[PDB]
Design an enzyme around this catalytic site. Structure first.
Site, PDB file in Angstrom:
ATOM      1  N   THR A 175       0.828  -1.203   0.000  1.00  0.00           N
ATOM      2  CA  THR A 175       0.000   0.000   0.000  1.00  0.00           C
ATOM      3  C   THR A 175       0.864   1.255   0.000  1.00  0.00           C
ATOM      4  O   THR A 175       0.498   2.271  -0.602  1.00  0.00           O
ATOM      5  CB  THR A 175      -0.932  -0.010   1.210  1.00  0.00           C
ATOM      6  OG1 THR A 175      -1.543  -1.298   1.322  1.00  0.00           O
ATOM      7  CG2 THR A 175      -2.030   1.025   1.052  1.00  0.00           C
ATOM      8  N   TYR A 193      11.126   0.055  16.736  1.00  0.00           N
ATOM      9  CA  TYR A 193      10.540   1.093  15.889  1.00  0.00           C
ATOM     10  C   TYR A 193       9.933   2.255  16.666  1.00  0.00           C
ATOM     11  O   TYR A 193       9.792   3.340  16.094  1.00  0.00           O
ATOM     12  CB  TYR A 193       9.481   0.513  14.951  1.00  0.00           C
ATOM     13  CG  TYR A 193      10.040  -0.203  13.742  1.00  0.00           C
ATOM     14  CD1 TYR A 193      11.370  -0.057  13.382  1.00  0.00           C
ATOM     15  CD2 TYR A 193       9.226  -0.992  12.941  1.00  0.00           C
ATOM     16  CE1 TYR A 193      11.879  -0.694  12.271  1.00  0.00           C
ATOM     17  CE2 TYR A 193       9.729  -1.636  11.827  1.00  0.00           C
ATOM     18  CZ  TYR A 193      11.057  -1.482  11.497  1.00  0.00           C
ATOM     19  OH  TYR A 193      11.569  -2.115  10.390  1.00  0.00           O
ATOM     20  N   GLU A 220       8.134  28.772   1.673  1.00  0.00           N
ATOM     21  CA  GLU A 220       9.449  29.399   1.588  1.00  0.00           C
ATOM     22  C   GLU A 220      10.544  28.381   1.293  1.00  0.00           C
ATOM     23  O   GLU A 220      11.308  28.543   0.335  1.00  0.00           O
ATOM     24  CB  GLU A 220       9.763  30.153   2.880  1.00  0.00           C
ATOM     25  CG  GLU A 220       8.892  31.369   3.130  1.00  0.00           C
ATOM     26  CD  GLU A 220       9.417  32.232   4.259  1.00  0.00           C
ATOM     27  OE1 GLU A 220      10.536  31.958   4.740  1.00  0.00           O
ATOM     28  OE2 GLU A 220       8.712  33.180   4.666  1.00  0.00           O
ATOM     29  N   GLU A 268      11.246  -5.735  -2.562  1.00  0.00           N
ATOM     30  CA  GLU A 268      11.327  -4.320  -2.210  1.00  0.00           C
ATOM     31  C   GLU A 268      11.996  -3.447  -3.278  1.00  0.00           C
ATOM     32  O   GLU A 268      11.505  -2.324  -3.493  1.00  0.00           O
ATOM     33  CB  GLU A 268      12.022  -4.181  -0.846  1.00  0.00           C
ATOM     34  CG  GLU A 268      12.106  -2.766  -0.307  1.00  0.00           C
ATOM     35  CD  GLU A 268      12.750  -2.705   1.063  1.00  0.00           C
ATOM     36  OE1 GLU A 268      13.170  -3.764   1.571  1.00  0.00           O
ATOM     37  OE2 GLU A 268      12.818  -1.600   1.641  1.00  0.00           O
TER      38      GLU A 268
HETATM   39  N1  LIG Z   1      11.383   4.131   8.728  1.00  0.00           N
HETATM   40  C1  LIG Z   1      10.467   3.272   9.161  1.00  0.00           C
HETATM   41  N2  LIG Z   1       9.950   2.325   8.304  1.00  0.00           N
HETATM   42  C2  LIG Z   1       9.017   1.445   8.741  1.00  0.00           C
HETATM   43  C3  LIG Z   1       8.578   1.489  10.055  1.00  0.00           C
HETATM   44  N3  LIG Z   1       7.660   0.513  10.219  1.00  0.00           N
HETATM   45  C4  LIG Z   1       7.509  -0.142   9.045  1.00  0.00           C
HETATM   46  N4  LIG Z   1       8.357   0.414   8.123  1.00  0.00           N
HETATM   47  C5  LIG Z   1       8.491   0.026   6.709  1.00  0.00           C
HETATM   48  O1  LIG Z   1       7.381  -0.750   6.311  1.00  0.00           O
HETATM   49  C6  LIG Z   1       7.769  -1.587   5.248  1.00  0.00           C
HETATM   50  C7  LIG Z   1       6.888  -2.828   5.185  1.00  0.00           C
HETATM   51  O2  LIG Z   1       5.601  -2.504   4.709  1.00  0.00           O
HETATM   52  P1  LIG Z   1       4.462  -2.092   5.758  1.00  0.00           P
HETATM   53  O3  LIG Z   1       4.508  -0.611   6.033  1.00  0.00           O
HETATM   54  O4  LIG Z   1       4.693  -2.875   7.021  1.00  0.00           O
HETATM   55  O5  LIG Z   1       3.046  -2.515   5.119  1.00  0.00           O
HETATM   56  P2  LIG Z   1       2.336  -1.707   3.923  1.00  0.00           P
HETATM   57  O6  LIG Z   1       3.109  -0.462   3.562  1.00  0.00           O
HETATM   58  O7  LIG Z   1       0.923  -1.360   4.316  1.00  0.00           O
HETATM   59  O8  LIG Z   1       2.307  -2.745   2.690  1.00  0.00           O
HETATM   60  P3  LIG Z   1       1.604  -4.188   2.812  1.00  0.00           P
HETATM   61  O9  LIG Z   1       2.322  -5.019   3.846  1.00  0.00           O
HETATM   62  O10 LIG Z   1       1.657  -4.892   1.479  1.00  0.00           O
HETATM   63  O11 LIG Z   1       0.165  -3.991   3.220  1.00  0.00           O
HETATM   64  C8  LIG Z   1       9.228  -1.915   5.511  1.00  0.00           C
HETATM   65  O12 LIG Z   1       9.958  -1.873   4.307  1.00  0.00           O
HETATM   66  C9  LIG Z   1       9.717  -0.830   6.445  1.00  0.00           C
HETATM   67  O13 LIG Z   1      10.703  -0.063   5.801  1.00  0.00           O
HETATM   68  C10 LIG Z   1       9.097   2.437  10.923  1.00  0.00           C
HETATM   69  O14 LIG Z   1       8.714   2.479  12.088  1.00  0.00           O
HETATM   70  N5  LIG Z   1      10.044   3.327  10.472  1.00  0.00           N
END
Ligand SMILES: Nc1nc2c(ncn2[C@@H]2O[C@H](COP(=O)(O)OP(=O)(O)OP(=O)(O)O)[C@@H](O)[C@H]2O)c(=O)[nH]1
Ligand SMILES: Nc1nc2c(ncn2[C@@H]2O[C@H](COP(=O)(O)OP(=O)(O)OP(=O)(O)O)[C@@H](O)[C@H]2O)c(=O)[nH]1
Ligand SMILES: Nc1nc2c(ncn2[C@@H]2O[C@H](COP(=O)(O)OP(=O)(O)O)[C@@H](O)[C@H]2O)c(=O)[nH]1
Ligand SMILES: Nc1nc2c(ncn2[C@@H]2O[C@H](COP(=O)(O)OP(=O)(O)O)[C@@H](O)[C@H]2O)c(=O)[nH]1
Ligand SMILES: [Mg+2]
Lengths: 426, 431, 99, 426, 431
Positions: free
Chosen positions: B137, B216, B246, B175
């Site tokens: 997503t 996290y 700005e 990814e």
């Molecule tokens: N920088 C950062 N990245 C996070 C954090 N938590 C999750 N992520 C990112 O989230 C990614 C995994 O996808 P998710 O956000 O867990 O799930 P999604 O974006 O809804 O996508 P789907 O799992 O297919 O539904 C990883 O590649 C992480 O980089 C966080 O606390 N900080």
């Protein structure tokens, strides 16, 4: 009698005039509520130049506040003297310029120029005989320099036989705090060279240099910078509101300082600046004013007259003083440093003496000096405008708002010709 | 009256809007019930006549496992029920699922909710968003997110806080396929775009904040401080004010170059706060260090294109302009030949606020720097090495083609991103 | 003329005081059982005379002027308290050297 | 002596009358019971212009309140000053007009026109000599404008040489709140051009502009709008009941305003209107107030005189004022702004001065100005009436009630004649 | 003085009516026995010498199982027993049986009690009838109810509040057969006629009122709130007062077109009222949503002819005309070029009153919009298709024909429905 309608443009303009409007309010003895709490009769005699009559024996300043952002419009309300301004003059908008000259001049500022032009006409046509107006703006910002030049370029056609003072805040080489600062400055000087009577170059670098080397202050807030600008602005229009032995209005300083209509850039300076430890070790004396007056440490611009020629020089005095010590001291500095002054004008200087000193003080002085050494200011801006424009820097922030790219070509060519006009007078 | 609608999307988005909106509440003294025990709150909260401050946030997710924790935890009574949007099935680490098949079902439902918030706005500064490249997503629906706000709201601001893959560690395998296929969307449909990868935030906490095992939450606070100080000048009075309009202008010279690098200073523990002095000079040198850099790339290889400064606390323009002079004299910091005065300075009065459970200390001064460099092409060429390495044997190609997107977009989004690396390199050549 | 102005000011102040008495009576009558719902009433009485978000002017009678000049919207200016210290103009004058 | 009988038409007439008799009973010092509690003898010296003598030191207004729905009538009687009116003057129907002109002009108004003509003839015989009448109504509905056009047309023929004042609230484009609203206005203005002596053009849209920008109303309900319209009505005919230095009653202000008998639609404005905050900074002098009477922001109509030509102006001042100023400021306006004003009529402006001011004020002024810019409000109504009538909008609600279809065509053709006649005077 | 007569026809009429009359008694503070523990009650109740009130309602039914529940419940002492009219045998979902065979046995009793109620009235504003298209004599006896009313009473108002057969959900097979034969009566003998279909009210109660399992009691509480806001300008003082005949003339462009669409705003729960403010501008935008519309048709397809709005509570005329300006600026909504000024506005000070045990919450500001669109041709050509799809193979014709009506009368309903859908096509064309 001869009246001046004050103008205020930008966050720099709203903070310059906020300190400025309370040092005249101390000068004429006005409480924050608005009424008169004075001691003598000379204070109330000539008060209609800057103030306007209200009911109940109250006075309101004849100024308008202009800005494109409501952010600093609050700070001029909650200040020490925020309740003294009439709310109808607080002109503001919704969308700012964001440190851009193009947004203020064509797209966003053109809807605010018509609102404030209605306001200034109501506070000018109600008066007896205007001398002119006065502007405060900054060339390091969006609404100060973008639409502030649109106020300048429009009221010239409306009122051609007037005066226009301005305290331009041009950028600084070391205290540069805006990436597109030269683009704002270079495209606005071309407006200032054509439609402005008098111009003062205010550099904050000169304000810091005075506050450290001469005044010894550890924490120079913008209150201490705005008070220094106001102290020069109060002492340059003194003789209208205070009678003197040899009085001089701002129109008299204009006619003696610009031998050619494009040569209207000055250098301001102030006479007594002294630290608290050094206060008891000096005596207020007429040579002591003019000794510190021509000192290059106390200039309010970032340029030194040793590299150029004093084309024409002013001197405005405040305080009970004599005529021979004003005259013998200044003929001394005309004669001893004869290599700096020009040769094709003898008696380069106009002098003036007023009676009433500023409060807490008994003597003072003020400087206005037109020189070729102020072309040091213009060459440093124009070498950096062409430096950015040779690689087409930030051009999408200006071209897409409606103005073509040829306006850049004429704005740097005109500013190049102005510097070439300064050089042949050196 | 100016205000910003935060648009968090993804499981990264829900967990980072959990920590960002915990910071905003204690910054303005709002209880978890939503009622306070000034108009600084008007950028992020809405005023019911009864006196409750409802946040203007849109949490977007396609899995119910992380949204339903918000509705159960401490802040259940604060968030408005229709503002937390949840799909049925997640895209499951996929661009193609979240873009053409699954994500098109709730695209009507979410952008009905932004209407109820934007029509409430009498004046809107711009939308803030948060998304991660790793997820489905965060990569698929977020690419349809930027395409239709572009149609619906033409000249609005769309700031980005993105999460980019780390150079060595990763939480997924496809990814890189998710990362490249959104480069075109964040090119034509993003105004400004920061990126933070987690490895360069992992290295900060172990040596600066003295945390042996961060999770996290100990990272989500640090990104919360970055979003706070950017919008702090919108909310609070200052000696000089800067806005979202700005710093867009004074950092982005070209429309193809809108990718900053976001840093922060100081980040020190409560034991290193007692010892080390923190003046304005001693915090503006930390943003230039490669150890405190928050992306895995070093400006020492690149060229400082532009700079933006945000200051908080008892900060004086004397110390700002003195230390700006010193950093310019040193030759380890380089500027390009066509940006002689490349700084922007912002100043606020209130010091940043400390939250319960945050391992930082209560500090007087702080600084947040957004310095755009040419060295952001360092991290891009490393990933395009790994994308073509992964695409060399045509692995994982069956997952994407059958969902509805074609295989011609595989060569398109690499050739689109190929020419962007050439543009970022030609700027650095002096005349 | 001065006497007329003072009389008008006193009459306006008396009318505002009468409203304050009535509003305090209504709030005190309503808050007999609980105070859970007196908050809109407290906000209404603490709104201030006129459309004013800034501080009241005590020497002027509590007047709160407004600032609504924004195209066709006319949105009121907000209010923010400042952490910056209050300064005295006499002390600023002595510190800057005009003493 | 010279007496005016007051007529109110419809719900809008009844609400307008409720505040109008509220503001001038306090002007004459009348208690809620109707007695006299006065301070000066000049208050009772002229009271027979609008009141009637009653036994026991009481006075009752000479007004009739005419509408069709009795729901709004009981709001008048149970109101604050509704116990003073004599109950025989409440003339009401049993069913509504349906926001239809024809129901109020042909179907139902033909039965209620006999009742009002019986009452108004028994009251016009009581006075010494009948100066004239007044009429308050709005063109947005059928109660005030349906029989309101019919009641004028029958009493004009009965009283051939009298003065007929009508207060019209013509529809507005932005604050339109009725679908059949242009059908009400365009076909009823035919009766206001041929059988009416004078008319004022009120816009509700202009009333919100003044109450939002100037008067500082957070919640401007119809009571505060009704305060402005009644204050305009009070200022016009204050010379009837109060002596002055130079006075002008309603007949003398009328015959110098109308150059031609079919041009009797004016635009009102009022001048000393200020907020709670801007009250102190404003000073109540003559050159202050003459700025705001001619200010285009304070018009009570949605037309801009800058687009047209001022043909004849009036100004009715009030308070102890010096006549030199009232004259030097008004000639100053005529010479400075020489583009708008007509060339074939020099010295355009009429002038009146009254001594006693409104309570709570020292000085006041009323603006009445007729121009060519009123054709903006007429062509805008004409195009919306032509747009609906091309596809025969709402035709069944008028054709079947007793009138044919060609009455609209002569309504459009006479409406075209008026707007073209305004052009040839421009 | 002003007063109306309610004619609740059918089993749907009784369940609607006892929802309405429960709301009216608590609105006017009248106990179930009729005696209270001011002339606001005069519009519907009739005063006697003992201090009671008799509602001016006639209940028209053909089955005794739906009247005897009224005579047994709490309101057995309220209604006069001769107002409840019960037939001997039901038509059992047959338009023809309730038109020619069953309905003429009790047609004399209905018109006799109509004479008694109109005799007591000093001036009669109009009639309200409540019925459904789906049932037998709710659609059948209503057809001959209008024939006797129009002949006897010339220009008295007769409002027809109806329930349209839903496009998907139905509780009958002859339901389209009953609906089309009622187009002859409503086109000829109806001053005004509303419709809301049940499938649209099903969508709103699930997502807005937060009810998992509602029945027809929760639907009829919503329809009671619509009628209450319509008639409250007759019963209470208003800043603008709008009568029954006022917006009757102002919504109909032609005598052939008298079919508005009714929607209400806000409809939120007592837990969601704790969160969102309900201003004048916020409730104005809610009536234009195709999701919150109470008819399964989309005005985005069609064109508005006119608009009637009914505000209640703390409603200022400043905020009403401000929100109208915003609606005209959006280009998603359209108006016909032959109606530039299409709105009508009414304001009443009294807030809507709530029922005990109901689902909604007490609200300051509410609005009930009556807009006539060309989107009603969407929901007619669907029903004309299904009326043609069943009748192609000549089904169920023997039941209707054998009761007395000829086979050619079905073909008469074809052309009158075909011509009426053509009259709605010529409205939507621009000049
Ligand atoms: N920088 C950062 N990245 C996070 C954090 N938590 C999750 N992520 C990112 O989230 C990614 C995994 O996808 P998710 O956000 O867990 O799930 P999604 O974006 O809804 O996508 P789907 O799992 O297919 O539904 C990883 O590649 C992480 O980089 C966080 O606390 N900080
Ligand atoms: N909206 C709404 N419709 C209802 C309700 N009750 C019944 N209906 C409708 O009524 C139709 C069937 O009619 P009935 O409820 O049997 O009542 P009737 O119209 O008198 O028909 P008969 O019982 O045969 O005389 C169904 O198609 C429903 O759509 C209700 O409470 N609300
Ligand atoms: N001398 C002086 N300079 C100021 C003041 N306020 C701001 N500045 C300078 O102006 C620049 C920012 O001005 P800005 O807010 O952009 O002006 P605006 O765009 O016209 O509102 C900074 O570099 C400051 O150094 C002031 O009160 N006095
Ligand atoms: N100036 C003014 N206009 C009003 C007032 N009340 C209603 N109106 C306007 O009058 C029109 C409707 O008038 P209406 O009530 O039908 O008058 P009636 O037909 O004589 O009863 C609307 O367009 C309103 O804007 C009021 O108190 N003052
Ligand atoms: Mg039945």
């Amino acid at each position: 009698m001869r009246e001046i309608v004050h103008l205020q443009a930008g966050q720099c303009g709203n903070q310059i005039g906020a300190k400025f409007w309370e040092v005249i309010s101390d000068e004429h003895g006005i409480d924050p509520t608005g009424t008169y709490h004075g001691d003598s009769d000379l204070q109330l005699e000539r008060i209609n130049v800057y103030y306007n009559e209200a009911t109940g024996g109250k006075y309101v300043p004849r100024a308008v506040l202009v800005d494109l952002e409501p952010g600093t419009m609050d700070s001029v309300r909650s200040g020490p003297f925020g309740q003294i301004f009439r709310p109808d003059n607080f002109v503001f908008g919704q969308s700012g310029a964001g440190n851009n000259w193009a947004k203020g001049h064509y797209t966003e500022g053109a809807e605010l120029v018509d609102s404030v032009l209605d306001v200034v006409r109501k506070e000018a046509e109600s008066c007896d005989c205007l001398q002119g107006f006065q502007l405060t703006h900054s060339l390091g910002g969006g609404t100060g320099s973008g639409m502030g030049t649109l106020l300048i370029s429009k009221i010239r056609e409306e009122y051609p036989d007037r005066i226009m003072n301005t305290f331009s805040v041009v950028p600084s080489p070391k205290v540069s705090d805006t990436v597109v600062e030269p683009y704002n400055a270079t495209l606005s000087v071309h407006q200032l060279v054509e439609n402005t009577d008098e111009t003062y170059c205010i550099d904050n670098e000169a304000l810091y240099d005075i506050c450290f080397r001469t005044l010894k202050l550890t924490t120079p807030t913008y209150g201490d910078l705005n008070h220094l600008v106001s102290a020069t602005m109060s002492g340059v229009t003194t003789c209208l509101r205070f009678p003197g032995q040899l009085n001089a209005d701002l129109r008299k300083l204009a006619v003696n300082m610009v031998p050619f209509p494009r040569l209207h850039f000055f250098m301001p300076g102030f006479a007594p600046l002294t630290s608290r430890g050094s206060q008891q070790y000096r005596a207020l004396t007429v040579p002591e004013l003019t000794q510190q007056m021509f000192d290059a440490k106390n200039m309010m611009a970032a340029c030194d007259p040793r590299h150029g020629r004093y084309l024409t020089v002013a001197a405005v005095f405040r305080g009970r003083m004599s005529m021979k010590e004003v005259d013998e001291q200044m003929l001394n500095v005309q004669n001893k440093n004869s290599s700096y002054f020009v040769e094709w004008i003898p008696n380069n200087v106009k002098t003036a003496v007023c009676d009433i000193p500023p409060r807490g003080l008994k003597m003072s002085a003020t400087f206005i000096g037109n020189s070729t050494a102020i072309q040091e200011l213009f060459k440093r801006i124009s070498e950096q405008f062409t430096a950015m424009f040779r690689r087409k820097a930030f051009l999408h922030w200006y071209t897409g708002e409606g103005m073509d790219e040829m306006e850049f070509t004429e704005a740097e060519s005109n500013m190049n010709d102005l510097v070439s006009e300064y050089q042949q007078y050196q | 009256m100016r205000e910003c609608i935060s648009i968090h999307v993804g499981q990264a988005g829900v967990q980072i809007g959990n920590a960002c909106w915990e910071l905003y509440c204690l910054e303005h003294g709002i209880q978890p019930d939503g009622q306070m025990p000034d108009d600084s709150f008007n950028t992020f909260f809405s005023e019911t006549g009864a006196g409750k401050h409802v946040p203007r946030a849109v949490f977007v997710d396609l899995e119910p496992t992380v949204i339903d924790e918000v509705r159960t935890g401490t802040y259940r009574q604060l968030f408005h029920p229709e503002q937390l949007i949840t799909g049925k099935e997640d895209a499951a680490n996929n661009y193609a699922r979240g873009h053409y098949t699954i994500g098109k079902e709730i695209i009507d439902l979410v952008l009905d909710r932004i209407r109820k918030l934007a029509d409430q706005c009498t004046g809107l500064q711009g939308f803030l968003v948060f998304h991660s490249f790793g997820g489905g997503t965060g990569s698929g629906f977020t690419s349809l997110l930027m395409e239709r706000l572009s149609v619906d709201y033409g000249k609005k601001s769309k700031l980005e806080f993105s999460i980019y893959p780390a150079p060595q560690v990763s939480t997924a395998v496809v990814e890189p396929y998710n990362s490249i296929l959104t480069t075109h969307t964040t090119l034509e449909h993003s105004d400004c775009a920061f990126m933070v990868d987690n490895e360069a935030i992992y290295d900060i906490c172990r040596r600066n904040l003295d945390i042996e095992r961060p999770t996290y939450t100990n990272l989500n606070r640090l990104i919360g401080q970055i979003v706070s100080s950017i919008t702090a000048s919108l909310r609070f009075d200052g000696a000089l004010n800067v806005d979202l309009t700005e710093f867009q202008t004074n950092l982005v010279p070209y429309p193809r170059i809108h990718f900053p690098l976001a840093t922060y200073a100081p980040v020190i523990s409560a034991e290193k706060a007692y010892h080390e002095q923190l003046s304005v000079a001693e915090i503006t040198n930390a943003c230039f260090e490669p150890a405190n850099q928050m992306v895995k790339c070093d400006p020492r290889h690149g060229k400082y294109m532009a700079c933006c400064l945000l200051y908080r606390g008892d900060v004086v323009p004397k110390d700002v302009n003195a230390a700006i002079a010193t950093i310019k004299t040193k030759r380890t910091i380089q500027f390009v030949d066509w940006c002689p005065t490349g700084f922007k300075v912002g100043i606020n009065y209130q010091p940043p606020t400390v939250v319960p459970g945050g391992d930082l200390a209560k500090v007087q001064r702080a600084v947040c720097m957004l310095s755009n460099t040419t060295a952001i092409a360092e991290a891009w060429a490393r990933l395009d090495h790994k994308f073509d390495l992964m695409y060399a044997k045509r692995a994982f190609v069956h997952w994407y083609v059958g969902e509805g997107m074609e295989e011609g977009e595989f060569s398109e989004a690499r050739e689109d991103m190929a020419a962007l690396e050439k543009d970022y390199e030609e700027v650095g050549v002096d005349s | 003329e001065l006497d007329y102005c003072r009389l008008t000011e006193a009459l306006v102040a008396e009318k505002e005081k009468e409203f304050q008495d009535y509003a305090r009576e209504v709030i005190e009558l309503e808050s007999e059982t609980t105070n859970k719902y007196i908050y809109p009433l407290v906000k209404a009485v603490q709104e201030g005379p006129g459309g004013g978000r800034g501080p009241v002017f005590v020497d002027r009678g509590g007047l709160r002027p407004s600032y609504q000049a924004n195209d066709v919207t006319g949105v009121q200016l907000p209010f923010y308290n400042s952490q910056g210290p209050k300064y005295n103009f006499q002390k600023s004058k002595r510190r800057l050297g005009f003493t």
